[PDB]
Amino acid sequence: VQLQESGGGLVQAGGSLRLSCVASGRTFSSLNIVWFRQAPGKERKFVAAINDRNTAYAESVKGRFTISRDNAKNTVHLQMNSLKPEDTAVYYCHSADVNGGMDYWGKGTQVTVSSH
Amino acid sequence: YAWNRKRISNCVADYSVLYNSASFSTFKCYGVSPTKLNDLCFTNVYADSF
Amino acid sequence: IRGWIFGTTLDSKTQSLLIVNNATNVVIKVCEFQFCNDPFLGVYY
Amino acid sequence: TNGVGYQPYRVVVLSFELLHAPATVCGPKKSTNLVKNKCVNFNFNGLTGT
Amino acid sequence: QDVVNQNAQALNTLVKQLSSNFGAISSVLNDILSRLDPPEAEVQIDRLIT
Ligand SMILES: *[C@@H]1O[C@H](CO)[C@@H](O)[C@H](O)[C@H]1NC(C)=O
């Protein structure tokens, strides 16, 4: 019925984060996830999507991530590796069902990363 | 690309309130006329909101 | 014969039309069923 | 901030089929008493005629 | 018998030609008129007439 996105804490460059998009639903395995990226005040963009059989990343996160599925929980999760200070964005996650087109858009999580 | 298709059936549909309310910038009907909608009983109606 | 099963995947991924025959109810629950390999109904003898 | 012409428009399409099934979506057209043996302008579910 | 059958076939074809759209939305004049306003139903009536 809805999606909530929680996480996106304060970490260091090169660290690992664990962001989960738990969905209020009962067939979210069919509702494949898409991750979207928005810069702090600049134009939006996508990140990744585990559309069941295979995956698809973006140019900024090409292969650097380990996208994961939680089909037994109907939840999605993204693994963040080789994080950079230039990826300071607000990641999203969305899924649209096959039947009766509809959106379960979330809220967003900060991707603030320090540089030194 | 995820247009919401809703099933409308087994109810009385009053299209006059939609037609007379000029809040819409484009109320176009192709196979019928908007003024005559209040005299036809329809087999099945689809609503596609997006 | 007690009914028929319909669908496209029959593994709870997609919708599945289902029909059962009974003396009282003929429920046609259109749900997402994680169907078994051998859906069968047993009657004592 | 963008000018008129790019702003979001809420679009709803009322697709429907006529005469091809038992009609379930009737207009707010009040029923009248039935008459027999006289040439009349009948209107059954949209099947108008004389 | 051939004379009778020729006349019957001619009348049957002439009657069955009343069920052809000729490009109109419907092959029934009453439903065309009851569904569309006159200004746009003009062309459908014209196709049926032709
Ligand atoms: C029909 O179903 C009811 C319960 O849904 C059951 O009590 C009844 O025995 C069934 N009729 C049969 C098995 O003939």
Side-chain angles (χ1 to χ4, degrees), chain C residues 2 22-25:
Chain C
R2 290 203 92 78
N22 196 67
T24 312
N25 49 5

Side-chain angles (χ1 to χ4, degrees), chain A residues 27 29 52 99, chain C residues 12-13 15 32:
Chain A
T27 183
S29 56
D52 206 0
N99 69 318
Chain C
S12 83
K13 173 81 159 194
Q15 269 183 78
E32 265 176 293

Side-chain angles (χ1 to χ4, degrees), chain A residues 8-28:
Chain A
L10 275 297
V11 296
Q12 197 185 2
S16 76
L17 272 165
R18 286 304 279 258
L19 265 59
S20 191
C21 287
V22 59
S24 309
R26 277 159 163 183
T27 183
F28 194 74

